[PDB]
Amino acid sequence: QPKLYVMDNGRMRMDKNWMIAMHNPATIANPNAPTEFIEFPIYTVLIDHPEGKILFDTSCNPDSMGAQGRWGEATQSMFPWTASEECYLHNRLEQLKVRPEDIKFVIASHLHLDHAGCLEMFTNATIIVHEDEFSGALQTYARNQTEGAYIWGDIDAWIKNNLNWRTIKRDEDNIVLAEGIKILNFGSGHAWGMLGLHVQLPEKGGIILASDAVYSAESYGPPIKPPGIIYDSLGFVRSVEKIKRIAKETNSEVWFGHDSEQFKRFRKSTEGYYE
Amino acid sequence: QPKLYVMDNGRMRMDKNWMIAMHNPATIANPNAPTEFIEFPIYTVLIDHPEGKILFDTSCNPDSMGAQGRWGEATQSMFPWTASEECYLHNRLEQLKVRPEDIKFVIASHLHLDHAGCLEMFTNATIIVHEDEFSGALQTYARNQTEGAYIWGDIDAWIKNNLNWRTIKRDEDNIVLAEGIKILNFGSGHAWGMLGLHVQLPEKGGIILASDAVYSAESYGPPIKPPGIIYDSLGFVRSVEKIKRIAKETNSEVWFGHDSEQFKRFRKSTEGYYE
Ligand SMILES: [Co+2]
Ligand SMILES: [Co+2]
Ligand SMILES: [Co+2]
């Protein structure tokens, strides 16, 4: 019988306009409306499953921040990540007696800086990613980009570590990984290719791991509120409505990528698990 | 030998984040980055062509602003329009001794509040609009929305006044209206359905009227910088690159929807015309 762990991998801050587009627009009375710098959790999910350990997302690389960090200067100042050492993925896994080598499957929701940071560690896993997301990230790597949400140094390491990739084709959906574990293909929206996960736990029932397909309850609505910069705005909305439909049809809880208040109510890996 | 006039129809102000998404994002050094209320012009173009007069866009309705205005309260405070009576479209057309009934074709780039405000004056003209733009605005009407970029009161009057609509089908493109005058179908992007115009003038050469498909030189780039909220982001980028391609292949100049510095340099209808 599977156990599912929520691992706390620190906090990030950014302009709220990135999370909720035009959340507070200028008006005649407030022509110089100040934005704000919200904080939100970064997290990862481990499913300790009889058929093999599954990891959903991988958080940020420990070498992300600082003068010698992988993230570019402007990226560090716009999306600072604060994490104590216990928050690093390898530490969180170690405290559960789980070594990187023990992971059979890693689902990369997408290849942004806060979800793909530690892919390089899982050299024995099959790494599951959307084919267009994989293609889009590799192109940014070939153009040698120092700034942005795709980290050159992270991608460099994935290639050097020769990860065993399995790309999800753009017309593939509902891919059964193990009993009660199903990959959901949301396609393009927030990024080129978003994957989610549906988990059926014997006791707790259905869970949908949405990652950045839905940032928060405010994004989810109604009304649906899209992020400030969006790759495929139509796809984004269509993906949110697909999540809602699946949630309703399967009586599933939806776990957002970065909701401070939802995350607060999760039992974390320091305290236990869901079964 | 056709003449082309540029009619100044006033100025509008709004949060710059509407024009250029995430122009000045929050940082650690500046967590409450203030936005800015920017000013830009609203304008329309009349082509005096021997085969018939042609109007491109129609600015805002004189009854838009104020306590009794058609624009919702929030809309007025986020997108205030300023204009003296001489800026009104019926007054610009009068100063040129052209009567609304003379106009053979009115091109509605799209049906937003600052481009479709005076469609109701043109009861004899053929009103050309993208079929999905028409559908979309009509839905907002049926839903009685009092706020937003589609104006319930304006749509009301279009229906009351029984306009002669010609919808451009979503697969139609390069529709010849008269010698040297061609409708360009950009499709979804900024709105559900964008139309531009290509104008071949004997002396001045090629002119592309982009309207809201490209706000300004900063939007055009490169790099292309999208608006802050955007209906169809992929569509938006596709249309800009189509505008670039056509401008290159025809050696045409691109007239943006709302570029202050470009507009400053145009020859207004008070001073003369292009030929
Ligand atoms: Co992301
Ligand atoms: Co994220
Ligand atoms: Co406009």
Author numbering:
A (entry chain C), B (entry chain I): 9 to 283
Copy the relevant paper text.
AaL (WP_021296945.1) is a lactonase isolated from the acidophilic, moderately thermostable bacterium Alicyclobacillus acidoterrestris. The quorum quenching lactonase AaL from the thermoacidophilic bacterium Alicyclobacillus acidoterrestris exhibits a very broad substrate range, being capable of hydrolyzing short and long chain AHLs with high proficiencies. AaL possesses a bi-metallic active site center. We show that AaL is capable of degrading δ-lactones and γ-lactones with high catalytic proficiency (>104 M−1 s−1) and shows some weak, promiscuous phosphotriesterase activity on the insecticide-derivated paraoxon. The crystal structure of AaL reveals a unique hydrophobic patch which could relate to its high specificity, and highlights a flexible active site loop which may be involved in substrate binding.
AaL was also crystallized bound to a glycerol molecule. Glycerol may originate from the cryoprotectant solution that contains glycerol. The molecule interact through two of its alcohol groups with the metal cations and with D122. In fact, an alcohol group is bridged with the α-metal, D122 and D220 at 2.0, 2.6 and 2.7 Å respectively and the second alcohol interacts with the β-metal (1.9 Å). Surprisingly, whereas the metal coordination is very similar to other lactonases from the MLL family (AiiA, AiiB, AidC) and the PLL family (SsoPox, SisLac, VmoLac), and the good resolution of the structure (2.15 Å), the putative metal cation-bridging water molecule is not visible in the electronic density maps. It is however difficult to conclude whether this molecule is present or not, since the observation of this water molecule can be difficult because of the strong density peaks corresponding to both metal cations, and the conserved coordination suggests that the conserved bridging water is present in AaL. When compared to the AaL structure bound to phosphate, both structures align very well, with the exception of the 237-loop. Additionally, the metal coordination is slightly different in the two structures. Indeed, the distance between the two metal cations is bigger in the glycerol bound structure, as compared to the phosphate bound one (4.0 Å and 3.5 Å, respectively). This lead to a shift in the position of the residues H120, H123, H266 and D220 which coordinates the metals.
